[PDB]
Design a protein around this ligand. Structure first.
Ligand SMILES: CCCCCCSC[C@H](NC(=O)CC[C@H]([NH3+])C(=O)O)C(=O)NCC(=O)O
Ligand SMILES: CCCCCCSC[C@H](NC(=O)CC[C@H]([NH3+])C(=O)O)C(=O)NCC(=O)O
Lengths: 209, 209
């Protein structure tokens, strides 16, 4: 620490980490980078992969949203209780990422003409998480194990935005629905989800959700 | 252990882990799933995300290539020496995964009309790795730290398949160039890259590379 997040004025791939930091009683600084400033091309060249978010943890500067989540999961004891849970947690996050990737594609390059096919294919992409929950304490705990982890925050964020994209998409997935309500009920997460910093911040950057 | 890899008859997203197991003097079982078998629709329904590779480490079953690479690094000591290196290795791997995905799209959906543009933009996607190297002991060591990690194996594979797609794509990247020649010189890796199991197996599944 301290923690500094450099990203555009949206939730996107920074919202899950923000949620994680809040739930963990952590404080951080927001360095907002507007699209206009970005289009000037000054900062972009200084970014490892030419993209944001960029994270700062003390003398450590990081890029890649999932590397950041994993770094927090590890430095905050949110990566399972043994090596086996760490692997399962990675397997879950990689899955959350694959779906997030498809989400972004739809939102930014084919919303109007691709939304119907997306929502149609959505159940097939959600079932895997529903299945995982059913095999872990009847879905009464977390995605992996009985302790929250970095994967939970990413999964939760993705589920929350899909409910915005497609209301009722979790109606046929009771475990996922209860899971979302449960983790959302966590006091520090509930406070974050209703905080002005979050609400006043759009999900994406093209005004679509 | 023992290890078992369940994947299609191609190098694709499994060659990195195979190369890692080979370099670490590990033994594994190869269950090749032909396209004919796959199309029987019996295997896919049992895969978490309906996809391969599937990995077996004793009683642990895993999916997602990077999750498997991370698991192997964690249980074999190929994940850096501290939390700082571990995070940078994740940052590197996420970058490798991003480019590998662009590579996959090119190969399977637009090789003919996309190859020109792809090779032209490749330098921009390779430079970050050249930079990471120049900031780590002048690039005479590995991608992160002074010991081989899971990220090196994934980066090495990605670089090697790109040299096939665009020979000499590393001519303007001396560090990556020497890096590839150096890691390929490692005895267990040199034997791996020369083994019939590796040589006989095509890079991808459509005959393109
Ligand atoms: C209201 C404004 C909303 C803006 C939303 C911007 S999303 C920007 C986009 N971000 C990413 O690609 C993040 C990738 C993520 N870190 C990963 O896992 O690879 C980017 O860096 N783009 C860099 C570029 O385009 O040059
Ligand atoms: C000569 C034959 C060559 C075959 C190459 C097959 S690549 C197959 C494809 N594999 C993947 O998508 C792996 C994804 C990887 N695990 C990741 O998520 O990063 C799959 O399982 N697809 C499942 C499906 O399409 O239903």
């Amino acid at each position: 620490p301290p923690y500094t997040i450099v990203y555009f004025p949206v939730r996107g791939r920074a919202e899950a980490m923000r949620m994680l930091l809040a739930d963990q009683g952590q404080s951080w600084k927001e360095e907002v980078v507007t699209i206009d400033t970005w289009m000037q091309g000054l900062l972009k060249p200084t970014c490892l992969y030419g993209q944001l978010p960029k994270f700062e943890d003390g003398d450590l500067t990081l890029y890649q949203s999932n590397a950041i989540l994993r770094h927090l999961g590890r430095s905050l004891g949110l990566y399972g209780k043994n090596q086996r849970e760490a692997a399962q947690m990675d397997m879950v996050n990689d899955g959350v990422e694959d779906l997030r990737g498809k989400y972004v594609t739809l939102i930014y390059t084919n919303y109007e003409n691709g939304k119907n096919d997306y929502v149609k294919a959505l159940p097939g992409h959600l079932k895997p998480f529903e299945t995982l929950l059913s095999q872990n304490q009847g879905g009464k705990a977390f995605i992996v194990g009985d302790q929250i982890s970095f994967a939970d925050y990413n999964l939760l964020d993705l589920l929350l935005i899909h409910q915005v994209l497609a209301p009722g998409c979790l109606d046929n997935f009771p475990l996922l629905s209860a899971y979302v309500a449960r983790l959302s009920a966590r006091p520090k997460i509930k406070a974050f989800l209703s905080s002005p910093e979050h609400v006043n911040r759009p999900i994406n950057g093209n005004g679509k959700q």
